[PDB]
Design an enzyme around this catalytic site. Structure first.
Site, short mmCIF file in Angstrom:
data_model
loop_
_atom_site.label_atom_id
_atom_site.label_comp_id
_atom_site.label_asym_id
_atom_site.label_seq_id
_atom_site.Cartn_x
_atom_site.Cartn_y
_atom_site.Cartn_z
N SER A 145 2.98 3.10 6.37
CA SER A 145 2.57 1.86 5.70
C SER A 145 2.43 1.97 4.17
O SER A 145 2.30 0.96 3.48
CB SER A 145 1.26 1.34 6.29
OG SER A 145 1.48 0.55 7.44
N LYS A 155 4.33 -0.26 1.65
CA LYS A 155 3.94 -1.64 1.39
C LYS A 155 3.40 -1.85 -0.02
O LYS A 155 3.52 -2.94 -0.58
CB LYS A 155 2.96 -2.15 2.46
CG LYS A 155 3.61 -2.28 3.83
CD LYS A 155 2.61 -2.41 4.97
CE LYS A 155 3.31 -2.26 6.32
NZ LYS A 155 2.36 -2.04 7.43
N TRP A 188 -0.15 -5.48 14.69
CA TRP A 188 -0.88 -5.14 13.47
C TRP A 188 -0.57 -6.07 12.30
O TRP A 188 -0.14 -5.65 11.23
CB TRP A 188 -0.71 -3.65 13.11
CG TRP A 188 -1.38 -2.82 14.15
CD1 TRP A 188 -0.78 -2.01 15.07
CD2 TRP A 188 -2.78 -2.78 14.43
NE1 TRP A 188 -1.73 -1.44 15.89
CE2 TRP A 188 -2.97 -1.91 15.52
CE3 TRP A 188 -3.90 -3.40 13.85
CZ2 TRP A 188 -4.23 -1.63 16.05
CZ3 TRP A 188 -5.16 -3.12 14.38
CH2 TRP A 188 -5.31 -2.25 15.47
N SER A 230 -2.43 -3.85 5.48
CA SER A 230 -1.23 -3.25 6.07
C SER A 230 -0.53 -4.20 7.04
O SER A 230 0.00 -3.77 8.07
CB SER A 230 -1.57 -1.94 6.78
OG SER A 230 -1.09 -0.84 6.04
N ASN A 235 1.91 -6.03 9.08
CA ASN A 235 3.30 -5.71 9.41
C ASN A 235 4.28 -6.88 9.34
O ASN A 235 5.37 -6.75 8.78
CB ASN A 235 3.38 -5.02 10.77
CG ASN A 235 3.05 -3.54 10.68
OD1 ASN A 235 3.48 -2.85 9.75
ND2 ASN A 235 2.29 -3.04 11.65
N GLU A 283 10.01 0.30 13.31
CA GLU A 283 10.87 1.47 13.48
C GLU A 283 10.72 2.56 12.41
O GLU A 283 11.04 3.72 12.66
CB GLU A 283 12.34 1.04 13.56
CG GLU A 283 12.70 0.28 14.82
CD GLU A 283 14.19 0.23 15.06
OE1 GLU A 283 14.96 0.50 14.11
OE2 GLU A 283 14.60 -0.07 16.20
N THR A 329 -2.93 2.98 1.87
CA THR A 329 -2.90 4.00 2.91
C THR A 329 -1.63 3.89 3.76
O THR A 329 -0.88 2.91 3.69
CB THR A 329 -4.13 3.87 3.83
OG1 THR A 329 -4.09 2.60 4.48
CG2 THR A 329 -5.42 3.96 3.02
N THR A 353 -0.42 5.21 7.95
CA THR A 353 -0.76 5.97 9.15
C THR A 353 0.30 5.75 10.21
O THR A 353 0.28 4.74 10.90
CB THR A 353 -2.12 5.53 9.73
OG1 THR A 353 -3.10 5.48 8.69
CG2 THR A 353 -2.58 6.48 10.83
#
EC number: 3.5.2.6
Lengths: 261, 161
Positions: A40, A43, A75, A100, A102, A138, A205, A207
């Site tokens: 992430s 972004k 998310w 984050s 998506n 992906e 961040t 993850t």
């Protein structure tokens, strides 16, 4: 370097760190040129590329984006909420950076010409290491030795510096990027955990969650002192290996110690 | 009062007031305004690159508005995930909720999103199901099934095997 070696062995994987004191020019470097998955953390640069394009395309940030359930992905706490009303490009950008989000990230990538569009932007500001190849979700595979959707701690930090403190973005856009990073809600236990609660921090961040792969980058403003820019990335050999926010915070502390901070 | 949980999510009901929602969730887990407008967003434990969460929508920005929308990710687990790319490909637009559940497994789905635009009337209700296979509910391999008035409008999946 020894303390870094110990930290990563306790962790059971690899840790890459690059930090710069923008007052002295001093750096700290550990595996800073190895590739780590972006997860992430891409972004953040996605938002910057949106801001850069808004300098070329007036009214870009205020463009209302309508989407349906077909555009949702897991998310997506913000875009899910505004499904019925849509969201502006600026709002999508803030959601991608700060939560984050998506679906928001994929919608923005679409505006930029996809993963190759973002990569091209990163090339344009002098970053030749950065590469995004795929979309959410992906791009989170984090397969060891897969160079797709990776960068290095040094390239991340150098780009972050140009965007937040340098001239990669015009002043108004630069401040917007900084403000978005400062408002991030996902990084309280990483780099932010390594510094006094009254120091301004902007961070993004990442993850992936597989292969103990996680990360954080940040600009930190120590009261009275010039800003510090740093990136901490982690990686581990086995799919079921867990990531550790604690390890990232600890690596950040080490990098800050190394800078005399 | 703890972090936001599935139990708290379930206990919170449509038609409730902001105050009740906060009572149950614990105002300390929750935020409103900012990116969430008049909605109330409550965080549980870390998950993904975020946190398990619920989001509660209200009939109006007014103080006495009622819950007309419930959303959650990673607060409810599936009872018996059996989804496969096979069954997913069997799901067709136009199916009722029951038809879809029979296809994907009556243990495979959780409610991602549930919204009543005409609350307290159920007319126009929209529903998102998040459906998981074998291991899909872990931290991988799941689907999104969305309905309007109980009829499937569409479907999407990620890494179904």
């Amino acid at each position: 370097a020894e303390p870094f070696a110990k930290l990563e062995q306790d962790f059971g994987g690899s840790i890459g760190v690059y930090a710069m004191d923008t007052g002295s020019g001093a750096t700290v470097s550990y595996r800073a040129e190895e590739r780590f998955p972006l997860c992430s953390s891409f972004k953040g640069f996605l938002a910057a590329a949106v801001l850069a394009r808004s300098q070329q395309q007036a009214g870009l940030l205020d463009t209302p984006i309508r989407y349906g359930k077909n555009a949702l992905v897991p998310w997506s706490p913000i875009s899910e909420k505004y499904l019925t009303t849509g969201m502006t490009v600026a709002e999508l950008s803030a959601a991608a950076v700060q939560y984050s989000d998506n679906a928001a990230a994929n919608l923005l990538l679409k505006e930029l010409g996809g993963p190759a569009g973002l990569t091209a932007f990163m090339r344009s500001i002098g970053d030749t290491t950065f590469r995004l190849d795929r979309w959410e979700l992906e791009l989170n595979s984090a397969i060891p030795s897969d160079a797709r959707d990776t960068s290095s701690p040094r390239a991340v930090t150098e780009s972050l510096q140009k965007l937040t403190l340098g001239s990669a973005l015009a002043a108004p856009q630069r401040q917007q990027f900084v403000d978005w990073l400062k408002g991030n809600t996902t990084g309280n236990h990483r780099i932010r955990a390594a510094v006094p609660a009254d120091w301004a921090v902007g961070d993004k961040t990442g993850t992936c969650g597989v292969y103990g792969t996680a990360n954080d980058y940040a600009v930190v403003w120590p009261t009275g002192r010039a800003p510090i820019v740093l990136a901490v990335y982690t990686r581990a050999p086995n799919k079921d290996d867990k990531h550790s926010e604690a390890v990232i915070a600890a690596a950040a502390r080490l990098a800050l110690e190394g800078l005399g901070v | 009062a703890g972090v936001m949980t599935g139990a708290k999510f379930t206990q919170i009901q449509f038609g409730m007031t902001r105050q009740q929602v906060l009572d149950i969730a614990g105002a300390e887990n929750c935020e409103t305004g900012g990116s969430f407008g008049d909605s109330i967003h409550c965080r549980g434990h870390a998950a993904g690159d975020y946190y398990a969460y619920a989001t509660f929508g209200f009939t109006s920005a007014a103080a006495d508005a009622k819950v007309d929308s419930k959303s959650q990710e990673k607060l409810l687990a599936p009872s018996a995930p059996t989804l496969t790319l096979a069954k997913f490909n069997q799901v067709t637009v136009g199916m009722t909720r029951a038809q879809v559940l029979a296809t994907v497994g009556q243990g495979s789905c959780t409610t991602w999103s549930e919204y009543y635009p005409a609350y307290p009337s159920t007319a126009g209700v929209t529903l998102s199901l998040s459906c998981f296979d074998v291991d899909g509910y872990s931290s991988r391999g799941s689907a999104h099934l969305w309905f309007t008035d109980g009829v499937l409008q569409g479907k999407r999946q990620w890494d179904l095997v």
